[PDB]
RNA sequence: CCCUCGA
DNA sequence: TATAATGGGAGCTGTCACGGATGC
DNA sequence: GCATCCGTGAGTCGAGGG
């Protein structure tokens, strides 16, 4: 099973809201090249290559683990969409 | 715009003629030697548009 | 002729471009724009006018020459030097070779 | 009918974890092929995409590094497994694929009961969710280990059966 | 179902049956534009009756109507759903004549048009949800704070 | 029902 | 520890009837007319049948097969009908706020019509578990509150109270009584039987219902 | 090795030729060997006799016909994709009535397909089989009215498309009604037309009270037969002018015309027998001396009234009874379509007699052969009873030729077929097998002919019985119809016999299918053998009596699915039918007469017979069958060997020394293994691959064409633009791959170039062209390449060129090249295995030999089967087969155990004892005692009640061995299996379903024209179908974007799919999906229906999904 | 003795807490050990394992 | 398409 | 472009349940 | 108010051959 899936289902009033949050966050991480991540270098999801451990390419993995850290804010009408876009482009260039 | 609805109703002959880019006057499809659409036929390029892009 | 209803499920569309083909043309246009960005604006524009990447058609040396306000020999020479720099850059980075099929 | 899909015979997976399924290498190579190309361009396996695709085209042109590349590609991702007929929603489930040798799809034992799947020669279809949204939906909602119970009853759906019960009882 | 050892929850059957009871027949038109014997949805006639009672008019007298799943399906408001189900010709004739509009409420309608279904992740309830990290959130907060 | 029969009858009128 | 006995008892494989056909007598058989033959197969599969026995048994088996196929077709049709009639139904809201409900009886009239006796556990469970109380229920010194999602333990407790004669029926929120338009609410639907918890808004319970009713259609004999 | 056979029942007669149904039907049909004057009026001769004479020159008549030699031999027809056929010439004479002029000529009617020696056909190079049809026999039937109790329906049924079904019913108002072509009218009218008078009807039918009074109508008897006739014609033909000759012609055509209305010979027979009358012709009435004369109707009505009244000697009919159901064989069907094409030919002939010069006409001028040819071609190609032959193994073909279908032309339509038709009738005994039949929708509709069963001249199936007189069983054998059978008391074949006399005072018999215990004095007849109850395939299952019918069925069918193996061996446990199955399938080669073998080769076998003549038998070698299985004959004899008549010269495919080999004999252990045999899955030893057990040869055909186009010709050449030498390496000078070359997916089988379509180069193409300074070539690479997942060694190349001797292709085609590729297939994971008892599974694991459970002597098992399969499936035959297989393993012998006659338990126990003596005796001889692990195991079994406490280890081990169980050591541990395990030899087949064929995956590929959705099929590299129910699934998970992905990006959304692919190769996220194209197609197809479909916003203002391109 | 029903109930309670998560894990464990012990058990089918009672 | 064969 | 020629020919069957109009 | 004819339905995916 997905790690801490239970706690995640506990976070939200509907499981589908969890899904949306996770997917959206994953898209944010893809877009900005994981420069917006709230995960400390030791908290980074890893992948075992032939060479050695590298960053987990999967943005949804990242999204869920981020979500579990309590460092993400979700909900409806938090901020204008274009304002969010522009500020994320500001802080983390693409 | 975003589609919020789908409507269906009867088509007036005037509406039908409004759709039409031409009348098909001939029961012809394609020429036997040239394999190209016959004029005023079911496959006519004059009516239903070009076979080749931008040509 | 015979009927599609005896059948047509086995009949592919050769007309519309495959996603692979379309992606290939896209990457082609983009790469071309890179290699042309490696040139000056005038010579790149001359190449685009002469090969018709702008309005869709190929202008003569008289039309491009009268466009930039020069002689046809001059504009042909510009086309040639542009093509030459393109050949040097391509020989160097070997980027556009794969698109030649 | 859809793209990014495949099918093959199913075979028992006993070593598999519940969230996993064996996916033949070739199948995975084809299904994920664009991702594989992009990854091959990210590493030094190919200068560009077209060269990489022309490289995968012939089977004798396929080397060892592309498989590791494919492994990197499918990491964390899930595929949809489906057996016909689909009577209820558990006719489709999500699995993190494990690349295997051979042409057969490996299926975890428990979920068999839901699929009404046995090893008398049943075949199954594979599907690849593309978007982050699709894969999120699949992993959270459609994962095998995330549905343990029947939506019809509320009794356990994935449960010990056959050999398992026999052993534990024994 | 019990006879065969199939454990099945009542509420599903209750869903279906609920859809079987979905329609009513008019015993008296009252002050409405409705006709005697005219069949419509219980919801619609209840709304109509609440409107007539709120207007001080005489409400519509109606009768409960039980129809099987096929008839209940074909009698639904969405012409797309009904036409896709079966008896396509009939459905389409009556729909075209009535100049019917499909509001795209259910799953079939949006599936045909290839839209995002109104269920699960597509639910208007959960689909407008936003996600932001505390850094970006605070930056935006300062942006709002300055003006 | 049958167009041929009908036209043949109509022809059998004259 | 006999293999057949072990497998049958455990639930790994086999039922008493199959075991009976192996060890015991094969049993009675039906004529093609549905009529039953007077002379049973006295033989087991262990001992082996005579060709006559085998022939009769063949009547039976053929009948069974035809039955199975035709059944598959009709069940499929039914399932699609159900999917078409129920598909617009989704959980669109938390509560419609209706005061309406249904009362699930814990007792059913005896066929002797002597008295009322307790309903079978599984059926009670099937009409109770995962539902929501429309009213306060106080039994055996326990408060089951209005709005409460009934757990399995809640159901079993209600059965205990029933046996103690404290409660003959349970008031419950139901899709039948839900005033939600185009779908049902959360409280009226109750649990998501897959997650053993309350149903998430956006769940399509119409399709889930259609599939739940449809899937064991080919098992119905 | 020594073969011990069991059973006490001596079969009086052997199995009849098993292909005889086909061969003799068609031989009866053509009558090619019969000199024309001696030909019977049956067959195509019949069709000629019905069609001719042709009148209104005035007259064209039929003299005789003949069949010439085939233009090409069978193999050559298969090669060139022709039809194996013979030319049909018919001698006709034209006669002018007035002139007296007679012009006679032999005209060419086209060809007719010739049936091969094994009962098949070659149609356009493909082997095909015409499957017999089963249908209700023509005749007069009486059935109970479902609505009205006590009332019955009379039904007069002729042959299919021989004219209408007629119903006679007694209406609630009392009048007797006749129903023809869905028209209800009083029968009395027709009775008047037939020339009957009220007097005759009163004396004849008056014996039945209150019945005949419904038949009395004064208005009908008030008019002569002519007036009544015209009345009937006015009733049956509204609006049509009631002319006298037109009415006479119509009714005569409906009833008395043999050219139109024909009861079968069978129909006539059954009518005569039922109604107790005699029919002059096969029609219901006659036209004689200007008036209609009755045959059928009055006896039919008489029987109806009699049955209605309760009069004894009158009963209803069972329409599923095999006395009332007959079989239409290949000859009858072919003859029917022949009659059709001939009728069309006749229409053409009269049409040609009306137009053209009247004085000069020849038969050649009047006859256009084409419609007949067209009819026959339609039959042998597009008919439903004409099926692609199953060549997978020989038994496949044999069974295919023995099939019976209720479907087809004139047959039942599915889903209208209830339980009754699929049911097993009591009359099925000895005739139609109760076991072999498909699973699913076709169940009971497709069936198989019993082993001893025969089809008679009237088309009824007959089964043999033995005469029993005074308790003495003779060798006299009588084949009976189901009716004749119902006339007798027939004892079972296992009935005790001392000499020819019945030794039991209580015998088991049947009376009308009803089982009954009777005296020897009462026994009229006795069964030939249990074999006669079952089909060929079902007869190949040993210990069948220990198997439940369903898994027996599975065993049969899967036996037909078995793949020929290079090393394939005959079963250790046989039913004894294997040799005959090989012989009758014409798979193997036999000696025609006694003689000495002169030459022996992998190619030919030359034999000198007693006549002194030298005959050379060529061997078919590595030929590709219809299903792609390898067909090759291996010589079984050596130079100088003395052979007698019927001895084996060579083994065919799936044959070992004349015995049918559908698979391998492997050593199995019944026990779970670590979840790998979970749910019917199977585990195998790698040793099986090492010695090449279950290894098969498969050949695939690849075909390309070079044709003339308007843009210039396609051509096969070694010059292919933009290709290296590496790709052209194995290509020969002409562009064809060389023999012996290994091909892999992507490799070129045949090089081909086609001129490019007219091309306006995109500006990018022009620029790039100018950059690399290379002219774009005129042609492009069309070459035929090896498809994904295929490949092998090229064993053959066929090239056919236009402008070359003996070669003329389709118009426009320059040449055709065929490439044959053979592949050797090892058994691999996903491949399907089965036994004859219905146990089937895919191999889920292949273990290295060191991981396999093994006997103490170090012998590893081959296959590991999970016991959990056995109890619910209730097939114990595999168990007994396993025990006896163990015995035969250590005794080095094979066994023949006839069904229901087979080896019983005690005999198997004896053999197992001997085997144990070999096993353990050898052990103790070698100087080793009992192993400790064996002791532990023995303690466990001692606790299990398997062995007697107090006995020595050897005694207990023997006790276990007789139970079929042995001590087994886990290969990974060395620790024994805690209990003893059943281990023995089992016969297992490798089924035709192989994962190599079935594995498919697609990223992107071809899309359909109109729908712009992915194509279906593996060959077309299609996408899987996501159907209504899968969409239901995704809806139920509530996954919206995955679903939307299925409905747009991955299928019919062009913008969406292109954007998606590009986004993914760029490394981006897939974009928002657009409108699906097939919905636009829906909008447009709805517009053509004059329906306006508008996509609107929330403000009800139109939205254009066509982006302006559809608007003016 | 552990059989179909008991194991099912185990999976259900466990399923509540141990639950979703550790019931995924528990399911896998039971699978493993179940298969192993089934293998070493000695389970097979002989013809003498179908036992005709004399009572018959 | 229909037929046949798989699930 | 001229003897006169003047109403066609297929037929094809062993299902069942519902709505709807149609006929005593 | 009750029989009778007419139209429309009757599981999925997969394979193969035509
Ligand atoms: Mg299966
Ligand atoms: Zn509610």
CA angle E29, E33, E37 (to 5 degrees): 45
User: G2 vs I16: CB contact, 8 Å cut-off?
Assistant: no
Distance H873 CA to ligand 1 centre (A): 14
Tokens of H879: 């168990």
Distance G92 CA to ligand 2 centre (A): 10
Burial class (CB in 10 A: 0-12, 13-18, 19+), E3: exposed
User: D150 vs G13: CB contact, 8 Å cut-off?
Assistant: no
Residue of H nearest to G11 (CA): H868
Q: Label residues I8-32 b or e (16+ Cβ within 10 Å = b).
A: bebbbebbeeebbbebbbbbbebbe
- Taking alpha carbons only, the member of H808, H805, H800, H785 closest to residue H705 is H800
Query: Which residue reads 């556990």 in tokens?
Result: G121
Would you say the C-alpha torsion G55, G57, G61, G62 has a positive or negative sign?
positive
Task: List CB contacts (< 8 A) between I48 and chain H.
Answer: 963-964
> Could you tell me the CA-to-CA distances from H530 to E55, G60, H15, H469 in Å, in that order?
88, 20, 12, 21
Count CB atoms within 10 A of the CB of residue H131.
23
Lay out the sheet containing H121-123: strands in order across. H121-123, H126-130, H386-388
**Residue count (chain H):** 1112
Q: Label residues H36-53 b or e (16+ Cβ within 10 Å = b).
A: eeebeebbbbbbbebbbe
Distance CA I33, CA I19 (A): 20
Q: Are residues H128 and H257 in the same domain?
A: no
- Which SS3 state, helix, strand or coil, does residue E115 take? coil
Element (H, E) at C65: helix C61-67
Tokens of H191: 């009775």
Q: If you measure CA to C1', which residue is closest to nucleotide K11?
A: H163
Distance CA H171, CA H165 (A): 18
Distance CA H296, CA H308 (A): 18
Cβ contacts from G onto I, under 8 A: 39
Q: Are residues H473 and H509 in the same domain?
A: yes
Largest CA distance in chain G: 69
Distance D87 CA to ligand 1 centre (A): 15
Do H485 and H323 touch, CB atoms closer than 8 A? no
In chain H, residues 252 through 271 whose Cβ sits under 7 angstroms from any atom of nucleic acid strand K = 253-254, 260
Q: Are residues H477 and H457 in the same domain?
A: no
Annotated domain spans of chain A = 1-94
CA of E88 to C1' of K21 (A): 21
| Nearest ligand by distance to the CA of G188 | 2
Residue of E nearest to B6 (CA): E102
Task: List CB contacts (< 8 A) between E111 and chain H.
Answer: 1031, 1035, 1043, 1047
Q: What subunits touch chain H, counting only 3 or more CB pairs under 8 A?
A: A, B, C, D, E, F, G, I
Q: C1' nearest to CA of D82: which nucleotide? A: L13
User: H1041 vs A23: CB contact, 8 Å cut-off?
Assistant: yes
Radius of gyration of chain H measured on its C-alpha atoms: 36
Q: Which residues contact H921 (CB under 8 A, 6 or more apart)?
A: none
| Nearest ligand by distance to the CA of G179 | 2
Distance CA H482, CA H707 (A): 60
Smallest Cβ–Cβ distance between D166 and the set G10, G126, G129 belongs to G10
Distance CA G192, CA H987 (A): 50
Distance CA G89, CA G131 (A): 18
CA of D123 to C1' of J6 (A): 9
Q: C1' nearest to CA of H414: which nucleotide? A: K15
Distance CA H595, CA H593 (A): 6
User: C19 vs H1004: CB contact, 8 Å cut-off?
Assistant: yes
CA of G94 to C1' of J5 (A): 51
Task: List CB contacts (< 8 A) between H811 and chain B.
Answer: none
Smallest Cβ–Cβ distance between G3 and the set I16, I49, I53 belongs to I49
Task: List CB contacts (< 8 A) between H1038 and chain A.
Answer: 16
Q: If you measure CA to C1', which residue is closest to nucleotide L14?
A: D123
Would you say the C-alpha torsion H565, H571, H574, H575 has a positive or negative sign?
negative
Chain J footprint positions (protein CB, under 7 Å): 1-7
Number of folded domains in chain H? 6
Long-range contact list for H620-623, CB < 8 A, 24+ apart? H622/H697, H622/H699, H622/H795, H622/H822, H623/H699
Q: Which residues contact H878 (CB under 8 A, 6 or more apart)?
A: H543, H835, H837, H839, H870, H986
Residue of I nearest to G196 (CA): I16
Do H545 and H25 touch, CB atoms closer than 8 A? no
Residue of I nearest to G44 (CA): I52
Residue of I nearest to G47 (CA): I52
Per-residue DSSP letters for H734-795? TSBBPTT-EE-TT-EEE--EEEPPP----HHHHHHHHHHT-PPPSEEE--EEPPTT--EEEE
Distance CA H697, CA G209 (A): 50
Q: Mind telling me how many Å the CA of E101 is from chain B's nearest CA?
A: 4
Task: List CB contacts (< 8 A) between E96 and chain H.
Answer: 1091-1092
> Could you tell me the CA-to-CA distances from H921 to A32, A88, H281, H916, H948 in Å, in that order?
79, 86, 80, 7, 21
Assess if residue H489 is contained within a domain. Answer: yes
Count CB atoms within 10 A of the CB of residue H150.
9
Q: Which residues contact H305 (CB under 8 A, 6 or more apart)?
A: H205, H208, H211, H212
Q: If you measure CA to C1', which residue is closest to nucleotide K16?
A: H416
Task: Say which DSSP state H254 is in.
Answer: I
Q: Are residues H295 and H186 in the same domain?
A: yes
Q: What subunits touch chain D, counting only 3 or more CB pairs under 8 A?
A: A, C, E, G, H, I
Do H333 and H340 touch, CB atoms closer than 8 A? no
Annotated domain spans of chain C = 17-97
Q: Are residues H831 and H960 in the same domain?
A: yes
Distance CA H276, CA D125 (A): 64
Q: What subunits touch chain F, counting only 3 or more CB pairs under 8 A?
A: H
Per-residue DSSP letters for H672-727? --TTTTSTT-EEEETHHHHTTTT-EEEEEEEEEEEE--TT---B--S--TT--HHH
Task: Say which DSSP state G181 is in.
Answer: S
Chains I and B touch (3+ CB pairs under 8 A): no
Question: Helices (DSSP H) in H31-94: which residue ranges?
Answer: 44-51, 74-79
Q: In this structure, what CATH number is given to the domain that contains residue H483?
A: 2.30.150.10
Distance CA E73, CA E80 (A): 11
Distance H947 CA to ligand 1 centre (A): 38
- Taking alpha carbons only, the member of B7, B6, H1096, B20 closest to residue E97 is B7
Distance E30 CA to ligand 2 centre (A): 29
Radius of gyration of chain B measured on its C-alpha atoms: 16
Distance CA D70, CA D75 (A): 9
Q: In this structure, what CATH number is given to the domain that contains residue H275?
A: 3.90.1110.10
Assess if residue H1102 is contained within a domain. Answer: no
Task: Say which DSSP state H432 is in.
Answer: B
- Which SS3 state, helix, strand or coil, does residue H458 take? coil
Do H883 and H984 touch, CB atoms closer than 8 A? yes
Query: Which residue reads 């096993």 in tokens?
Result: H919
Q: Are residues H216 and H257 in the same domain?
A: yes
Burial class (CB in 10 A: 0-12, 13-18, 19+), B19: middle
Task: List CB contacts (< 8 A) between G24 and chain I.
Answer: 52-53, 56
Q: Mind telling me how many Å the CA of C45 is from chain D's nearest CA?
A: 27
Distance CA H443, CA H419 (A): 10
Kindly give the pairing relationship between strand D105-107 and strand H126-130.
unpaired
Assess if residue H275 is contained within a domain. Answer: yes
Burial class (CB in 10 A: 0-12, 13-18, 19+), H244: exposed
Check whether the bond before D85 is cis (ω within 30° of 0).
yes
Tokens of H164: 């209408």
Task: Say which DSSP state H569 is in.
Answer: B
Give which of E78, E114, E118, E121 to mutate to test H binding, by max H Cβ within 10 Å: E114
Largest CA distance in chain I: 52
User: B7 vs E99: CB contact, 8 Å cut-off?
Assistant: yes
Partners of H91 in the beta sheet? Answer: H64, H106
> Could you tell me the CA-to-CA distances from H475 to B27, H481, H485, H532 in Å, in that order?
77, 19, 18, 16
Element (H, E) at H655: strand H655-656
Q: Method used for this model?
A: X-ray
User: B3 vs E113: CB contact, 8 Å cut-off?
Assistant: yes
Q: Which domain holds residue H85?
A: 16-137+318-463+529-587
Distance H841 CA to ligand 1 centre (A): 9
* CATH class name, domain A1-94: alpha beta
Q: Mind telling me how many Å the CA of D139 is from chain E's nearest CA?
A: 13
Give contacts of H 636-695 with I, CB under 8 A: 670-675, 678
Distance CA H819, CA H798 (A): 7
CA of F5 to C1' of K10 (A): 13
Question: φ, ψ for residue H262 (rounded to 5)?
Answer: -135, 120
Partners of E18 in the beta sheet? Answer: none
> Could you tell me the CA-to-CA distances from C88 to H208, H770, H772 in Å, in that order?
114, 14, 11
Task: List CB contacts (< 8 A) between D147 and chain G.
Answer: 194
Query: Which residue reads 């032309």 in tokens?
Result: H409
Q: Are residues H980 and H860 in the same domain?
A: yes
Q: Are residues H82 and H207 in the same domain?
A: no
Q: Mind telling me how many Å the CA of E54 is from chain B's nearest CA?
A: 30
Partners of H605 in the beta sheet? Answer: H600, H617
- Known binder of ligand: residue G23? no
- Helices G3-10 and G16-23 pack at an angle, to 10 degrees, of 170
User: D154 vs E9: CB contact, 8 Å cut-off?
Assistant: yes
Resolution in A: 3.2
- Which SS3 state, helix, strand or coil, does residue G149 take? strand
Domain with residues C17-97, CATH architecture: Orthogonal Bundle (1.10)
Task: List CB contacts (< 8 A) between C34 and chain D.
Answer: none
User: I16 vs G45: CB contact, 8 Å cut-off?
Assistant: no
Q: Are residues H278 and H205 in the same domain?
A: yes
Is B5 an 8 Å CB contact of chain E?
A: yes
- Taking alpha carbons only, the member of H344, H337, H341 closest to residue H372 is H341
């Amino acid at each position: 099973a997905e790690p801490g899936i239970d706690k995640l289902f506990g976070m939200v009033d509907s499981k589908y809201r969890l899904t949306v949050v996770v997917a959206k966050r994953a898209q944010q991480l893809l877009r900005h090249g994981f420069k917006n991540t709230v995960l400390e270098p030791e908290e980074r999801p890893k992948m075992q290559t032939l060479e050695g451990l590298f960053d987990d390419p999967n943005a949804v993995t990242w999204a869920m683990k981020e979500l579990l850290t309590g460092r993400l804010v979700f909900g409806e009408n938090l901020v204008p969409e274009d304002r969010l876009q522009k500020e994320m482009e500001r802080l983390y260039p693409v | 715009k975003e589609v919020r609805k789908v409507r269906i109703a009867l088509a007036s002959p005037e509406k039908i003629r409004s759709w039409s880019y031409g009348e098909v006057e001939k029961p012809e499809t394609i020429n036997y030697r040239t394999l190209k659409p016959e004029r005023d036929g079911l496959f006519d390029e004059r009516i239903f548009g070009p076979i080749k892009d931008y040509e | 002729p015979v009927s599609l209803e005896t059948y047509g499920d086995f009949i592919p569309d050769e007309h519309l471009p495959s996603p692979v083909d379309a992606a290939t043309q896209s990457l082609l246009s983009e790469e071309l724009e890179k290699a042309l960005s490696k040139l000056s604006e005038r010579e790149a524009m001359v190449l685009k006018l002469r090969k018709g990447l702008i309005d869709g058609r190929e202008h003569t040396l008289e039309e491009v020459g009268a466009f930039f306000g020069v002689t046809r020999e001059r504009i042909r020479q510009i086309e040639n030097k542009a093509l030459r720099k393109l050949k040097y850059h391509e020989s160097r980075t070997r980027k556009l070779r794969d698109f030649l099929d | 009918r859809v793209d990014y899909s495949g099918r093959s015979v199913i075979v028992v997976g006993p070593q598999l974890k519940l969230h996993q399924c064996g996916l033949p290498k070739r199948m995975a190579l084809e299904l994920f092929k664009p991702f594989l190309l992009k990854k091959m361009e990210e590493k030094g396996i190919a200068p560009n995409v077209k060269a990489a695709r022309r490289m995968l085209e012939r089977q004798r042109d396929i080397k060892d590094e592309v498989w590791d590349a494919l492994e990197e590609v499918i990491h964390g991702k899930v595929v949809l497994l489906n057996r016909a007929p689909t009577l209820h929603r558990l006719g489709i489930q999500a699995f993190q694929p494990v690349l295997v040798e051979g042409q057969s799809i490996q299926l975890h034992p428990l979920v068999c009961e839901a699929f009404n799947a046995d090893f008398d020669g049943d075949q199954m279809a594979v599907h690849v969710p593309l978007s982050s949204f699709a894969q999120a939906e699949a992993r959270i909602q459609m994962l095998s280990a995330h549905n343990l119970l029947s939506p019809a009853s509320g009794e356990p759906l994935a449960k010990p059966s056959r050999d398992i019960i026999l052993g534990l009882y024994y | 179902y019990r006879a065969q050892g199939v454990k099945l929850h009542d509420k599903h059957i209750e869903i279906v049956v609920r859809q079987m009871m979905k329609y009513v027949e008019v015993t008296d038109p009252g002050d409405s534009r409705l006709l005697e014997g005219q069949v419509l949805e219980k919801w619609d006639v209840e709304a109509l009756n609440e409107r007539l009672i709120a207007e001080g008019k005489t409400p519509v007298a109606w009768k409960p109507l039980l129809m099987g799943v096929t008839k209940s399906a074909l009698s639904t408001k969405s012409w797309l759903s009904a036409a896709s189900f079966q008896n396509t010709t009939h459905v389409l004739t009556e729909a075209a004549i009535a100049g019917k509009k499909d509001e795209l409420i259910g799953l079939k309608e949006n599936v045909i048009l290839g839209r995002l279904i109104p269920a699960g992740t597509g639910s208007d309830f959960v689909r407008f949800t936003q996600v932001v990290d505390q850094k970006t959130l605070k930056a935006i907060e300062e942006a709002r704070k300055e003006a | 029902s049958d167009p041929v029969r009908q036209y043949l009858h109509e022809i059998g009128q004259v | 520890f006999n293999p057949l006995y072990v497998m049958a008892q455990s639930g790994a494989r086999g039922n008493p009837q199959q075991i009976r056909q192996l060890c015991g007598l094969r049993g009675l058989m039906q004529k093609p007319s549905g009529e039953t033959f007077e002379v049973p197969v006295r033989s087991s599969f262990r001992e082996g049948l005579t060709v006559l026995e085998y022939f009769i048994s063949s009547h039976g088996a053929r009948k069974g097969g035809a039955d199975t196929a035709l059944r598959t077709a009709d069940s499929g049709y039914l399932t699609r009908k159900l999917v078409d009639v129920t598909h617009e139904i989704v959980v669109r809201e938390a509560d419609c706020g209706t005061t309406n409900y249904i009362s699930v009886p814990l007792f059913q009239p005896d066929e002797v019509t002597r008295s009322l006796r307790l309903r079978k556990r599984a059926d009670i469970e099937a009409g109770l578990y995962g539902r929501v109380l429309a009213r306060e229920v106080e039994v055996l010194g326990v408060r089951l509150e209005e709005g409460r999602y009934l757990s399995m333990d809640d159901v079993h407790l209600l059965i205990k109270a029933a046996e103690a004669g404290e409660i003959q029926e349970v008031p419950v929120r139901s899709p039948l009584t839900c005033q939600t338009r185009y779908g049902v609410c959360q409280k009226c639907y109750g649990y998501d039987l897959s997650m053993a918890r309350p149903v998430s808004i956006g769940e399509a319970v119409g399709i889930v219902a259609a599939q739940s009713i449809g899937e064991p259609g080919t098992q119905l004999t | 090795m020594e073969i011990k056979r069991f059973g006490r029942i001596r079969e009086v007669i052997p199995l009849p030729p098993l292909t005889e149904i086909q061969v003799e039907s068609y031989r009866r049909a053509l009558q090619a060997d019969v000199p024309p004057e001696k030909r019977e009026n049956v067959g195509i001769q019949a069709a000629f006799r019905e069609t001719f004479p042709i009148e209104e020159g005035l007259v064209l008549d039929f003299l005789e016909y003949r069949l010439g030699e085939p233009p090409f031999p069978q193999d050559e027809c298969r090669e060139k994709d022709l039809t194996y056929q013979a030319p049909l010439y018919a001698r006709l004479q034209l006669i002018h009535k007035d002139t007296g002029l007679i012009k006679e000529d032999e005209v060419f009617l086209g060809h007719i397909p010739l049936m091969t020696e094994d009962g098949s056909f070659i149609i356009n190079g493909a082997d095909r089989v015409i499957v017999s049809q089963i249908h209700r026999s023509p005749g007069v039937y009486f059935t109970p009215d479902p609505a009205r109790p006590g009332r019955y329906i009379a039904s007069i049924i002729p042959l299919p498309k021989r004219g209408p079904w007629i119903d006679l019913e007694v209406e609630p108002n009392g009048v007797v009604s006749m129903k023809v072509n869905k028209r209800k009218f009083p029968l009395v009218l027709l009775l008047r037309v037939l020339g009957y008078d009220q007097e005759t009807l009163a004396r004849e039918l008056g014996a039945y009270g209150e019945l005949v009074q419904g038949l009395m109508d004064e208005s009908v008897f008030a008019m002569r037969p002519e007036e009544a006739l015209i009345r009937l014609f006015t009733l049956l033909r509204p609006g049509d002018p009631p002319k006298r000759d037109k009415a006479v012609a119509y009714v005569y055509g409906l009833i008395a015309d043999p050219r139109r209305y024909d009861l079968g010979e069978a129909g006539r027979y059954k009518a005569e027998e039922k109604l107790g009358i005699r029919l002059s012709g096969r029609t219901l009435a006659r036209f004689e001396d200007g008036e209609f004369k009755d045959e059928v109707f009055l006896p039919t009505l008489r029987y109806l009234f009699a049955l209605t009244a309760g009069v004894p000697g009158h009963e209803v009919d069972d329409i599923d009874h095999l006395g009332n159901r007959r079989i239409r064989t290949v000859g009858e069907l072919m003859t029917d379509q022949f009659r059709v094409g001939l009728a069309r030919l006749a229409r053409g002939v009269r049409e040609r007699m009306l137009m053209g010069s009247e004085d000069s006409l020849t038969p050649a001028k009047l006859v256009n052969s084409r419609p007949l040819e067209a009819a026959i071609r339609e039959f042998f190609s597009r008919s439903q009873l004409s099926q692609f032959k199953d060549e997978t193994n020989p038994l496949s073909s044999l069974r295919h030729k023995r099939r019976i279908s209720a479907l087809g032309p004139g047959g039942l339509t599915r889903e209208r077929a209830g339980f009754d038709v699929r049911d097993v009738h009591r009359t099925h005994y000895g005739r139609i097998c109760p076991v072999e039949t498909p699973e699913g929708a076709n169940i009971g509709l497709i069936t198989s002919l019993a082993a001893y069963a025969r089809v008679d001249e009237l088309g009824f199936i007959r089964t043999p019985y033995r005469r029993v007189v005074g308790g003495v069983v003779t060798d006299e054998v009588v084949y009976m119809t189901a009716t004749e059978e119902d006339r007798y008391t027939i004892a079972q074949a296992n009935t005790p016999l001392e000499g020819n006399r019945i030794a039991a005072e209580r015998v088991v018999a049947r009376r009308k299918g009803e089982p009954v215990i009777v005296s020897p004095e009462e026994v009229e007849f006795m069964d030939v053998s249990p074999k006669q109850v079952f089909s060929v395939n079902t007869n190949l299952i040993p210990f069948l009596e220990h198997d439940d019918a369903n898994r027996a069925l599975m065993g049969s069918n899967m036996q037909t699915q078995a793949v020929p193996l290079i090393r394939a061996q005959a079963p250790v446990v046989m039913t004894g039918l294997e040799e005959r199955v090989v012989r009758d399938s014409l798979a193997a080669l036999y000696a025609e007469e006694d003689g000495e073998v002169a030459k022996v080769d992998g190619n030919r076998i030359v034999v000198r017979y007693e006549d002194g003549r030298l005959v050379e038998y060529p061997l078919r070698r590595f030929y590709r069958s219809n299903q792609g299985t390898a067909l090759d004959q291996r010589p079984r004899v050596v130079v100088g060997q003395r052979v007698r008549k019927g001895d084996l010269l060579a083994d065919g495919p799936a044959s070992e020394n004349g015995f049918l080999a559908l698979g391998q004999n492997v050593l199995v252990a019944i026990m779970p293994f670590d979840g790998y045999n979970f749910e019917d899955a199977i585990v195998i030893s790698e040793e099986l691959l090492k010695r090449d057990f279950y290894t098969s040869i498969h050949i695939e055909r690849y075909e390309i064409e070079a044709r003339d186009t308007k843009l210039g010709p396609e051509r096969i050449t070694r010059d292919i633009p933009h290709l290296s030498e590496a790709a052209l390496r194995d290509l020969d000078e002409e562009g064809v791959v060389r023999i012996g070359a290994e091909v892999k997916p992507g490799d070129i089988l045949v090089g081909r170039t086609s001129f490019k379509g007219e091309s306006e180069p995109t500006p990018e193409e022009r620029l790039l062209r100018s950059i690399f300074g290379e002219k774009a070539r005129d042609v492009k690479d069309t070459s035929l390449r090896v498809p994904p997942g295929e490949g092998g060694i090229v064993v053959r190349t066929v090239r056919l060129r236009r402008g070359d001797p003996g070669v003329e292709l389709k118009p426009g085609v320059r040449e055709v090249v065929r490439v044959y590729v053979a592949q050797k297939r090892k058994l691999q994971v996903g491949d399907k295995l089965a036994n004859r008892h219905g146990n089937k599974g895919v191999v889920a694991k292949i273990l290295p030999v060191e991981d396999m459970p093994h006997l103490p002597d170090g012998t590893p098992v081959d296959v590991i089967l999970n016991p959990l399969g056995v109890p619910s499936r209730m097939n114990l035959g595999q168990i007994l087969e396993t025990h006896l297989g163990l015995a035969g393993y250590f005794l080095g012998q094979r066994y023949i155990s006839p069904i229901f006659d087979g080896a019983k338990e005690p005999e198997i126990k004896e053999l197992l004892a001997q085997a144990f003596e070999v096993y353990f005796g050898k052990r103790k001889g070698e100087g080793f005692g009992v192993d400790k692990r064996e002791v532990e195991v023995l303690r466990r079994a001692e606790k299990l009640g398997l062995v007697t406490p107090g006995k020595t280890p050897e005694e207990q081990l023997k006790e276990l061995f007789l139970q079929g169980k042995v001590v087994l050591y886990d290969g990974r541990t060395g620790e024994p299996i805690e209990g003893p395990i059943v281990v023995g030899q089992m016969f297992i087949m490798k089924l035709y379903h192989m994962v190599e064929d079935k594995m498919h995956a697609r990223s992107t590929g071809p899309y359909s024209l109109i729908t712009q959705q992915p194509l279906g099929g593996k060959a077309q590299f299609g996408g899987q179908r996501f159907g209504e129910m899968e969409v239901w699934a995704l809806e139920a998970y509530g996954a919206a974007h995955t679903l939307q992905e299925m409905l747009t990006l991955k299928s019919d959304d062009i913008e969406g799919r292109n954007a998606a692919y590009e986004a993914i190769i760029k490394g981006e996220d897939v974009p928002e999906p657009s409108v699906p194209e097939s919905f636009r197609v829906l909008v447009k197809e709805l517009q053509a229906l004059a329906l306006d479909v508008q996509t609107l916003d929330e403000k009800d203002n139109p939205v254009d999904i066509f982006e302006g391109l559809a608007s003016k | 003795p552990q059989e179909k029903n008991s194991l099912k109930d185990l999976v259900y309670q466990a399923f509540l807490r141990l639950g979703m998560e550790k019931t995924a894990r528990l399911l896998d464990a039971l699978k493993y050990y179940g298969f192993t012990f089934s293998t070493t058990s000695g389970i097979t089918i002989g013809i003498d394992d179908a036992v005709i009672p004399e009572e018959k």
